[PDB]
Amino acid sequence: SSLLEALNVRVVGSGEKVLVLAHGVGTDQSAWQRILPYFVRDHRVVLYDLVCAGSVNPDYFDFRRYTSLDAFVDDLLAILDALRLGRCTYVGHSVSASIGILASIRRPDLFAKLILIGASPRFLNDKNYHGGFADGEIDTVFAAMEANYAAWVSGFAPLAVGADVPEAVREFSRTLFNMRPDITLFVSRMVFNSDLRGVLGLVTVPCSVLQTSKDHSVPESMAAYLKENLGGRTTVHMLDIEGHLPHLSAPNLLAQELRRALP
């Protein structure tokens, strides 16, 4: 159950151009805090928290509804329809890249462009498809998270940040610790098992695939896979930034690439 205030939707900035900044699992909209300065001067920047963000009242997280990314797409589309700001450029990091992809195929009218950071249509390896994870790989990760959430965060946040950026590890550790562990585990499992490869061809809006350097969850070959399989006009931008969270670890460089990717 996700309302406009429930997901902490905020519109900051000025300008007719609308930018949507959509964070991934483990953080909230504060993940974008350092990127906002680069766009509020000429964008009305739409931010919101995924239902799973620690900044959202966990009672709003319905376990029987959020069994697929589609319910997340419902929230995103409900927000853009609630805001009624019209055509917008959507920036989706990780799961929010998948959410934006699925949202654009339902409502291509809403999105002038998709900017996809840390995007993967499927983490599991498959037939000639390398997602980056074998069958047994993620089990130990979900095990550590359920067994000792704090020890898991202490390891996962520096891995997710990648580069030695203590402020990024701090911010990501914080938002991870703000999430109820059963929600983190449930969403991470749901998101990890999602497979969007079959709908990439249905995308019609153009996409910018911002591929980050050393992503524990996204191989570099994923950028080319998304280019080949996304159905719209797709440009790949291989980020110099290392790590799954370039918006946290190198916001100025990321913002530069983000600005360049805008329509």
PDB file of all heavy atoms in Angstrom, residues 14 17 22 26 44 72-73 75 81 93 109 124 137 143 156 180 184 189 198 201-202 211 233-234 240 242-243 253 263:
ATOM      1  N   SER A  14      13.302  23.480 -10.534  1.00  0.00           N
ATOM      2  CA  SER A  14      12.512  24.283 -11.451  1.00  0.00           C
ATOM      3  C   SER A  14      12.892  23.930 -12.882  1.00  0.00           C
ATOM      4  O   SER A  14      13.981  23.414 -13.149  1.00  0.00           O
ATOM      5  CB  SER A  14      12.727  25.781 -11.213  1.00  0.00           C
ATOM      6  OG  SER A  14      14.068  26.148 -11.497  1.00  0.00           O
ATOM      7  N   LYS A  17      11.436  20.623 -17.812  1.00  0.00           N
ATOM      8  CA  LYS A  17      11.938  19.259 -17.899  1.00  0.00           C
ATOM      9  C   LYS A  17      11.757  18.535 -16.569  1.00  0.00           C
ATOM     10  O   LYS A  17      12.043  19.083 -15.500  1.00  0.00           O
ATOM     11  CB  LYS A  17      13.408  19.268 -18.317  1.00  0.00           C
ATOM     12  CG  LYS A  17      13.632  19.818 -19.717  1.00  0.00           C
ATOM     13  CD  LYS A  17      15.101  19.836 -20.109  1.00  0.00           C
ATOM     14  CE  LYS A  17      15.909  20.762 -19.225  1.00  0.00           C
ATOM     15  NZ  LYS A  17      17.317  20.879 -19.708  1.00  0.00           N
ATOM     16  N   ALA A  22      15.197   7.347  -9.252  1.00  0.00           N
ATOM     17  CA  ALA A  22      14.617   6.177  -8.604  1.00  0.00           C
ATOM     18  C   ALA A  22      15.750   5.271  -8.142  1.00  0.00           C
ATOM     19  O   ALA A  22      16.503   4.739  -8.962  1.00  0.00           O
ATOM     20  CB  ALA A  22      13.662   5.451  -9.548  1.00  0.00           C
ATOM     21  N   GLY A  26      18.085  -1.306  -0.919  1.00  0.00           N
ATOM     22  CA  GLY A  26      19.092  -1.062   0.086  1.00  0.00           C
ATOM     23  C   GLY A  26      19.304   0.397   0.395  1.00  0.00           C
ATOM     24  O   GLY A  26      19.953   0.716   1.399  1.00  0.00           O
ATOM     25  N   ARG A  44      12.527  19.816 -12.727  1.00  0.00           N
ATOM     26  CA  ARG A  44      11.721  19.438 -11.575  1.00  0.00           C
ATOM     27  C   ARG A  44      12.049  17.975 -11.320  1.00  0.00           C
ATOM     28  O   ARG A  44      11.595  17.091 -12.046  1.00  0.00           O
ATOM     29  CB  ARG A  44      10.239  19.655 -11.841  1.00  0.00           C
ATOM     30  CG  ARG A  44       9.811  21.111 -11.768  1.00  0.00           C
ATOM     31  CD  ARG A  44       8.302  21.239 -11.577  1.00  0.00           C
ATOM     32  NE  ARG A  44       7.482  20.563 -12.584  1.00  0.00           N
ATOM     33  CZ  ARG A  44       7.601  20.700 -13.907  1.00  0.00           C
ATOM     34  NH1 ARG A  44       8.516  21.492 -14.450  1.00  0.00           N
ATOM     35  NH2 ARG A  44       6.790  20.028 -14.715  1.00  0.00           N
ATOM     36  N   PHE A  72       5.827  -2.827  -7.870  1.00  0.00           N
ATOM     37  CA  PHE A  72       6.689  -1.648  -7.839  1.00  0.00           C
ATOM     38  C   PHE A  72       6.392  -0.724  -9.013  1.00  0.00           C
ATOM     39  O   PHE A  72       6.371   0.500  -8.859  1.00  0.00           O
ATOM     40  CB  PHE A  72       8.155  -2.073  -7.856  1.00  0.00           C
ATOM     41  CG  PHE A  72       8.647  -2.612  -6.546  1.00  0.00           C
ATOM     42  CD1 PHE A  72       8.539  -3.959  -6.249  1.00  0.00           C
ATOM     43  CD2 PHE A  72       9.239  -1.772  -5.619  1.00  0.00           C
ATOM     44  CE1 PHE A  72       8.998  -4.456  -5.046  1.00  0.00           C
ATOM     45  CE2 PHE A  72       9.697  -2.268  -4.401  1.00  0.00           C
ATOM     46  CZ  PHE A  72       9.580  -3.607  -4.120  1.00  0.00           C
ATOM     47  N   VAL A  73       6.159  -1.296 -10.198  1.00  0.00           N
ATOM     48  CA  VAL A  73       5.772  -0.484 -11.348  1.00  0.00           C
ATOM     49  C   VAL A  73       4.460   0.237 -11.071  1.00  0.00           C
ATOM     50  O   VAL A  73       4.274   1.395 -11.465  1.00  0.00           O
ATOM     51  CB  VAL A  73       5.681  -1.358 -12.613  1.00  0.00           C
ATOM     52  CG1 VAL A  73       5.220  -0.529 -13.798  1.00  0.00           C
ATOM     53  CG2 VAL A  73       7.023  -1.994 -12.902  1.00  0.00           C
ATOM     54  N   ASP A  75       3.321   1.342  -8.179  1.00  0.00           N
ATOM     55  CA  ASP A  75       3.636   2.510  -7.363  1.00  0.00           C
ATOM     56  C   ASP A  75       4.237   3.627  -8.209  1.00  0.00           C
ATOM     57  O   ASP A  75       3.778   4.775  -8.156  1.00  0.00           O
ATOM     58  CB  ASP A  75       4.585   2.118  -6.231  1.00  0.00           C
ATOM     59  CG  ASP A  75       3.963   1.137  -5.263  1.00  0.00           C
ATOM     60  OD1 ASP A  75       2.717   1.064  -5.209  1.00  0.00           O
ATOM     61  OD2 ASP A  75       4.719   0.439  -4.556  1.00  0.00           O
ATOM     62  N   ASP A  81       1.392   9.430 -12.290  1.00  0.00           N
ATOM     63  CA  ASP A  81       0.008   9.813 -12.555  1.00  0.00           C
ATOM     64  C   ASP A  81      -0.545  10.714 -11.457  1.00  0.00           C
ATOM     65  O   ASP A  81      -1.423  11.543 -11.716  1.00  0.00           O
ATOM     66  CB  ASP A  81      -0.875   8.574 -12.704  1.00  0.00           C
ATOM     67  CG  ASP A  81      -0.731   7.916 -14.057  1.00  0.00           C
ATOM     68  OD1 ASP A  81      -0.318   8.614 -15.008  1.00  0.00           O
ATOM     69  OD2 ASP A  81      -1.053   6.710 -14.175  1.00  0.00           O
ATOM     70  N   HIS A  93      18.197   3.227 -10.949  1.00  0.00           N
ATOM     71  CA  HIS A  93      19.375   2.502 -10.509  1.00  0.00           C
ATOM     72  C   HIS A  93      18.971   1.092 -10.101  1.00  0.00           C
ATOM     73  O   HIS A  93      18.035   0.910  -9.316  1.00  0.00           O
ATOM     74  CB  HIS A  93      20.081   3.205  -9.352  1.00  0.00           C
ATOM     75  CG  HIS A  93      21.140   2.363  -8.722  1.00  0.00           C
ATOM     76  ND1 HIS A  93      20.993   1.793  -7.477  1.00  0.00           N
ATOM     77  CD2 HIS A  93      22.341   1.951  -9.187  1.00  0.00           C
ATOM     78  CE1 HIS A  93      22.068   1.080  -7.194  1.00  0.00           C
ATOM     79  NE2 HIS A  93      22.904   1.165  -8.211  1.00  0.00           N
ATOM     80  N   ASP A 109       4.200   6.671 -22.976  1.00  0.00           N
ATOM     81  CA  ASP A 109       3.882   8.092 -23.001  1.00  0.00           C
ATOM     82  C   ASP A 109       4.600   8.858 -21.896  1.00  0.00           C
ATOM     83  O   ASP A 109       4.975  10.019 -22.090  1.00  0.00           O
ATOM     84  CB  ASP A 109       2.371   8.279 -22.866  1.00  0.00           C
ATOM     85  CG  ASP A 109       1.828   7.716 -21.558  1.00  0.00           C
ATOM     86  OD1 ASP A 109       1.733   6.477 -21.429  1.00  0.00           O
ATOM     87  OD2 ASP A 109       1.491   8.513 -20.656  1.00  0.00           O
ATOM     88  N   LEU A 124      20.880 -14.221 -12.548  1.00  0.00           N
ATOM     89  CA  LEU A 124      21.330 -15.591 -12.741  1.00  0.00           C
ATOM     90  C   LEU A 124      21.902 -15.776 -14.141  1.00  0.00           C
ATOM     91  O   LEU A 124      21.396 -15.217 -15.119  1.00  0.00           O
ATOM     92  CB  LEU A 124      20.177 -16.565 -12.507  1.00  0.00           C
ATOM     93  CG  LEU A 124      19.779 -16.816 -11.053  1.00  0.00           C
ATOM     94  CD1 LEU A 124      18.473 -17.592 -10.992  1.00  0.00           C
ATOM     95  CD2 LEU A 124      20.881 -17.576 -10.330  1.00  0.00           C
ATOM     96  N   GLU A 137      25.183 -19.509  -5.785  1.00  0.00           N
ATOM     97  CA  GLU A 137      25.953 -18.353  -5.332  1.00  0.00           C
ATOM     98  C   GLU A 137      25.165 -17.491  -4.357  1.00  0.00           C
ATOM     99  O   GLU A 137      25.678 -17.106  -3.302  1.00  0.00           O
ATOM    100  CB  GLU A 137      26.394 -17.515  -6.531  1.00  0.00           C
ATOM    101  CG  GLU A 137      27.766 -17.852  -7.059  1.00  0.00           C
ATOM    102  CD  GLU A 137      28.230 -16.851  -8.094  1.00  0.00           C
ATOM    103  OE1 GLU A 137      28.777 -15.799  -7.697  1.00  0.00           O
ATOM    104  OE2 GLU A 137      28.036 -17.112  -9.301  1.00  0.00           O
ATOM    105  N   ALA A 143      21.567 -16.267   3.137  1.00  0.00           N
ATOM    106  CA  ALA A 143      21.758 -16.922   4.426  1.00  0.00           C
ATOM    107  C   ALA A 143      22.420 -15.978   5.423  1.00  0.00           C
ATOM    108  O   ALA A 143      21.946 -15.817   6.553  1.00  0.00           O
ATOM    109  CB  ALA A 143      22.591 -18.194   4.248  1.00  0.00           C
ATOM    110  N   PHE A 156      28.551  -6.337   2.807  1.00  0.00           N
ATOM    111  CA  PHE A 156      27.922  -6.026   1.529  1.00  0.00           C
ATOM    112  C   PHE A 156      28.061  -4.560   1.133  1.00  0.00           C
ATOM    113  O   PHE A 156      28.243  -4.264  -0.053  1.00  0.00           O
ATOM    114  CB  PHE A 156      26.440  -6.407   1.559  1.00  0.00           C
ATOM    115  CG  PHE A 156      25.698  -6.041   0.302  1.00  0.00           C
ATOM    116  CD1 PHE A 156      25.993  -6.670  -0.892  1.00  0.00           C
ATOM    117  CD2 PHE A 156      24.709  -5.069   0.314  1.00  0.00           C
ATOM    118  CE1 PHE A 156      25.314  -6.343  -2.047  1.00  0.00           C
ATOM    119  CE2 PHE A 156      24.026  -4.737  -0.843  1.00  0.00           C
ATOM    120  CZ  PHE A 156      24.331  -5.375  -2.023  1.00  0.00           C
ATOM    121  N   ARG A 180      13.863  -2.990   7.411  1.00  0.00           N
ATOM    122  CA  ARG A 180      13.566  -4.171   8.202  1.00  0.00           C
ATOM    123  C   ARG A 180      14.156  -5.391   7.504  1.00  0.00           C
ATOM    124  O   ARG A 180      13.909  -5.594   6.303  1.00  0.00           O
ATOM    125  CB  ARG A 180      12.063  -4.331   8.405  1.00  0.00           C
ATOM    126  CG  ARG A 180      11.706  -4.824   9.807  1.00  0.00           C
ATOM    127  CD  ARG A 180      10.212  -4.865  10.013  1.00  0.00           C
ATOM    128  NE  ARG A 180       9.562  -5.754   9.059  1.00  0.00           N
ATOM    129  CZ  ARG A 180       8.249  -5.799   8.862  1.00  0.00           C
ATOM    130  NH1 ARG A 180       7.452  -4.990   9.547  1.00  0.00           N
ATOM    131  NH2 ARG A 180       7.735  -6.643   7.975  1.00  0.00           N
ATOM    132  N   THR A 184      14.246  -6.481   3.499  1.00  0.00           N
ATOM    133  CA  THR A 184      15.463  -6.583   2.696  1.00  0.00           C
ATOM    134  C   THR A 184      15.599  -7.973   2.087  1.00  0.00           C
ATOM    135  O   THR A 184      15.855  -8.117   0.885  1.00  0.00           O
ATOM    136  CB  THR A 184      16.690  -6.256   3.546  1.00  0.00           C
ATOM    137  OG1 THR A 184      16.483  -5.020   4.235  1.00  0.00           O
ATOM    138  CG2 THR A 184      17.935  -6.152   2.676  1.00  0.00           C
ATOM    139  N   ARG A 189      15.417 -11.381  -2.548  1.00  0.00           N
ATOM    140  CA  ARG A 189      15.086 -12.651  -3.184  1.00  0.00           C
ATOM    141  C   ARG A 189      14.191 -12.435  -4.394  1.00  0.00           C
ATOM    142  O   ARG A 189      14.477 -12.933  -5.486  1.00  0.00           O
ATOM    143  CB  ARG A 189      14.409 -13.583  -2.181  1.00  0.00           C
ATOM    144  CG  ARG A 189      15.357 -14.302  -1.252  1.00  0.00           C
ATOM    145  CD  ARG A 189      14.594 -15.207  -0.290  1.00  0.00           C
ATOM    146  NE  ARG A 189      15.499 -16.009   0.525  1.00  0.00           N
ATOM    147  CZ  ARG A 189      15.209 -16.446   1.745  1.00  0.00           C
ATOM    148  NH1 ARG A 189      14.044 -16.143   2.300  1.00  0.00           N
ATOM    149  NH2 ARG A 189      16.093 -17.171   2.416  1.00  0.00           N
ATOM    150  N   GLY A 198      12.806 -11.141 -21.485  1.00  0.00           N
ATOM    151  CA  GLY A 198      11.738 -11.299 -22.452  1.00  0.00           C
ATOM    152  C   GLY A 198      10.930 -10.054 -22.740  1.00  0.00           C
ATOM    153  O   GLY A 198      10.148 -10.051 -23.696  1.00  0.00           O
ATOM    154  N   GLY A 201      12.802  -6.420 -25.443  1.00  0.00           N
ATOM    155  CA  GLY A 201      12.429  -6.124 -26.814  1.00  0.00           C
ATOM    156  C   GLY A 201      11.194  -5.259 -26.926  1.00  0.00           C
ATOM    157  O   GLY A 201      10.983  -4.623 -27.960  1.00  0.00           O
ATOM    158  N   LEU A 202      10.376  -5.212 -25.878  1.00  0.00           N
ATOM    159  CA  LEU A 202       9.150  -4.429 -25.914  1.00  0.00           C
ATOM    160  C   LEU A 202       9.377  -2.965 -25.572  1.00  0.00           C
ATOM    161  O   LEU A 202       8.476  -2.143 -25.775  1.00  0.00           O
ATOM    162  CB  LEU A 202       8.128  -5.033 -24.956  1.00  0.00           C
ATOM    163  CG  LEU A 202       7.869  -6.528 -25.139  1.00  0.00           C
ATOM    164  CD1 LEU A 202       6.842  -7.011 -24.122  1.00  0.00           C
ATOM    165  CD2 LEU A 202       7.416  -6.803 -26.560  1.00  0.00           C
ATOM    166  N   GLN A 211      26.771   1.879 -17.557  1.00  0.00           N
ATOM    167  CA  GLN A 211      27.370   0.656 -17.049  1.00  0.00           C
ATOM    168  C   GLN A 211      28.533   1.032 -16.147  1.00  0.00           C
ATOM    169  O   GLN A 211      29.452   1.734 -16.578  1.00  0.00           O
ATOM    170  CB  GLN A 211      27.854  -0.223 -18.205  1.00  0.00           C
ATOM    171  CG  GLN A 211      28.512  -1.512 -17.779  1.00  0.00           C
ATOM    172  CD  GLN A 211      27.519  -2.502 -17.226  1.00  0.00           C
ATOM    173  OE1 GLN A 211      26.543  -2.853 -17.887  1.00  0.00           O
ATOM    174  NE2 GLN A 211      27.751  -2.948 -15.999  1.00  0.00           N
ATOM    175  N   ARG A 233      15.914   2.906 -29.045  1.00  0.00           N
ATOM    176  CA  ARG A 233      17.252   3.390 -29.350  1.00  0.00           C
ATOM    177  C   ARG A 233      18.060   3.434 -28.061  1.00  0.00           C
ATOM    178  O   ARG A 233      17.684   4.120 -27.109  1.00  0.00           O
ATOM    179  CB  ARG A 233      17.198   4.763 -30.011  1.00  0.00           C
ATOM    180  CG  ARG A 233      18.567   5.348 -30.233  1.00  0.00           C
ATOM    181  CD  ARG A 233      18.528   6.636 -31.038  1.00  0.00           C
ATOM    182  NE  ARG A 233      19.875   7.184 -31.144  1.00  0.00           N
ATOM    183  CZ  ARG A 233      20.742   6.848 -32.090  1.00  0.00           C
ATOM    184  NH1 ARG A 233      20.398   5.974 -33.031  1.00  0.00           N
ATOM    185  NH2 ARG A 233      21.951   7.387 -32.102  1.00  0.00           N
ATOM    186  N   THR A 234      19.158   2.690 -28.020  1.00  0.00           N
ATOM    187  CA  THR A 234      19.909   2.491 -26.789  1.00  0.00           C
ATOM    188  C   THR A 234      21.352   2.908 -27.002  1.00  0.00           C
ATOM    189  O   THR A 234      21.992   2.467 -27.961  1.00  0.00           O
ATOM    190  CB  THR A 234      19.846   1.026 -26.343  1.00  0.00           C
ATOM    191  OG1 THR A 234      18.478   0.617 -26.239  1.00  0.00           O
ATOM    192  CG2 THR A 234      20.522   0.845 -25.000  1.00  0.00           C
ATOM    193  N   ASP A 240      33.395   5.283 -15.905  1.00  0.00           N
ATOM    194  CA  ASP A 240      34.702   5.159 -15.274  1.00  0.00           C
ATOM    195  C   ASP A 240      34.558   4.731 -13.818  1.00  0.00           C
ATOM    196  O   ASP A 240      35.413   4.013 -13.287  1.00  0.00           O
ATOM    197  CB  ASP A 240      35.441   6.496 -15.374  1.00  0.00           C
ATOM    198  CG  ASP A 240      36.943   6.358 -15.211  1.00  0.00           C
ATOM    199  OD1 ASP A 240      37.412   5.298 -14.749  1.00  0.00           O
ATOM    200  OD2 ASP A 240      37.656   7.330 -15.537  1.00  0.00           O
ATOM    201  N   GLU A 242      33.911   2.918 -10.503  1.00  0.00           N
ATOM    202  CA  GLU A 242      33.806   1.536 -10.073  1.00  0.00           C
ATOM    203  C   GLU A 242      32.752   1.406  -8.979  1.00  0.00           C
ATOM    204  O   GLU A 242      32.562   2.307  -8.159  1.00  0.00           O
ATOM    205  CB  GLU A 242      35.162   1.011  -9.587  1.00  0.00           C
ATOM    206  CG  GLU A 242      35.318   0.920  -8.079  1.00  0.00           C
ATOM    207  CD  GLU A 242      36.725   0.521  -7.657  1.00  0.00           C
ATOM    208  OE1 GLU A 242      37.125  -0.629  -7.934  1.00  0.00           O
ATOM    209  OE2 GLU A 242      37.426   1.346  -7.039  1.00  0.00           O
ATOM    210  N   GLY A 243      32.047   0.286  -8.994  1.00  0.00           N
ATOM    211  CA  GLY A 243      31.132  -0.030  -7.921  1.00  0.00           C
ATOM    212  C   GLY A 243      29.678   0.098  -8.346  1.00  0.00           C
ATOM    213  O   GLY A 243      29.326   0.819  -9.283  1.00  0.00           O
ATOM    214  N   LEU A 253      31.030  12.706 -11.012  1.00  0.00           N
ATOM    215  CA  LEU A 253      31.257  12.016 -12.277  1.00  0.00           C
ATOM    216  C   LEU A 253      29.964  11.401 -12.796  1.00  0.00           C
ATOM    217  O   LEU A 253      29.636  11.523 -13.982  1.00  0.00           O
ATOM    218  CB  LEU A 253      32.337  10.945 -12.111  1.00  0.00           C
ATOM    219  CG  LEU A 253      33.787  11.443 -12.109  1.00  0.00           C
ATOM    220  CD1 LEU A 253      34.770  10.275 -12.109  1.00  0.00           C
ATOM    221  CD2 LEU A 253      34.044  12.360 -13.296  1.00  0.00           C
ATOM    222  N   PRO A 263      17.883  13.668 -22.532  1.00  0.00           N
ATOM    223  CA  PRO A 263      17.495  13.936 -23.923  1.00  0.00           C
ATOM    224  C   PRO A 263      17.722  15.390 -24.327  1.00  0.00           C
ATOM    225  O   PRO A 263      18.055  16.195 -23.457  1.00  0.00           O
ATOM    226  CB  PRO A 263      16.003  13.594 -23.943  1.00  0.00           C
ATOM    227  CG  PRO A 263      15.547  13.852 -22.544  1.00  0.00           C
ATOM    228  CD  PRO A 263      16.710  13.437 -21.668  1.00  0.00           C
TER     229      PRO A 263
END
